Subunit: 116 residues, 4 copies
């Protein structure tokens, strides 16, 4: 599991459950090619997006569908979605966790990049 | 000044100076049209991006060029840029401040929306 | 104005108004002595806490009364308060801005330290 | 495991490993009584702090010894320590995770409160 996404809710103090997450890889012509997607679990995590063989160096975009998340909870949100855009680099560690902390008018994100 | 950007550096405990910012607006064909750009001052603030007349209703993307910022300080950061994507002015004209807090492997952003 | 506090609300996308702040300084006996207090204005800012003369070197604790803030808006938050504890002026006088971003179950804080 | 602490490093993009964490419970006379302590693991987590029988309702303080963390990595930090102060309430969920994201001049914290 070289790529994991973990989403938390700063209003409810809970995992962000059943959030849609789409990953894209930047193509040669600078367009965004669908790569992987899924919905966060009851723990706010999304595992199994890709495999070591599929996850090559390059620029990736993780889109988190925050607007749908907030409106399913009855909350008015600011953003259309959250975006995390980063380069995967085979130098240094090989497991990427993209973590996001959501509020209606704000979000935080960090990267946790490690070896097993 | 209906759109402003303010950026802080969480490593230095200082304004983030000379941060490039590019604003896009979603066009009729659903592409991202360049709208405005500038860079943060010595105070970490970017004023004068647009006008009340030109800042019409739409979906806007504020790209904050965090990689360029960190590389210019000699640091190899995680992200390519921070994105803030939102619908603006859909209940009439508002003033938006996009605030960001930067670290090499993490950033936060918030919006301050006021009615003049 | 060598110590200032600025607070934003990540649910409302607005300044956090009428936030009570209490500042303490560690005394010779290692207890927390009350130093100064105030509350955020309509802009989310708190000016006039102290003076250059009175703001001597020491360990300071800035308590931001987040529970009181959220309860006054009818919300039952997680935290009692946010604390920011730091040594001030140990390389000579500096100006400190303590910035905070509030959600009901989460907060962020940063320091902006400048040399006048 | 009713109380867990999880610490991440926003400069290195890693867990915050071998950080000292002290938990206190507020006594009747408003002093802070030592309650539990430990050091974060290789995953930035601290498990086994307390037991259901020991963790009663009341106000708790989680101190994270960030200053020692940063100076063991050769980094100049702002804060003396990070503080998280909250009420444990048997109404609603019974597992508390206190998560913290560290930068030299900033920190974020959230609460993830759940049932199994
Ligand atoms: C204080 C803070 C800030 C940010 C951007 C993420 C998180 C966070 C998000 C998801 C998670 C996942 C990995 C978890 O809860 O196990 C952990 C976190 F510390 C916490
Ligand atoms: C994204 C983020 C994170 C944190 C901890 C503070 C702030 C913040 C708080 C107050 C202000 C005030 C001083 C302002 O200039 O609007 C600015 C900020 F960027 C923004």
């Amino acid at each position: 599991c070289p790529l994991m996404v973990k989403v938390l809710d700063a209003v409810r103090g809970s995992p962000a459950i059943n959030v849609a997450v789409h990953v894209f890889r930047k193509a040669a012509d600078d367009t965004w090619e669908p790569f992987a997607s899924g919905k966060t679990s009851e723990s706010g995590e999304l595992h199994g997006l890709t495999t070591e063989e599929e996850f090559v160096e390059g620029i990736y975009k993780v889109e988190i569908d925050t607007k749908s998340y907030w409106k399913a909870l009855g909350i008015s949100p600011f953003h259309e979605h959250a975006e995390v855009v980063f380069t995967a680099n085979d130098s240094g560690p090989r497991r990427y966790t993209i973590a996001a902390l959501l509020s209606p008018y704000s979000y935080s994100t960090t990267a946790v990049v490690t070896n097993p």
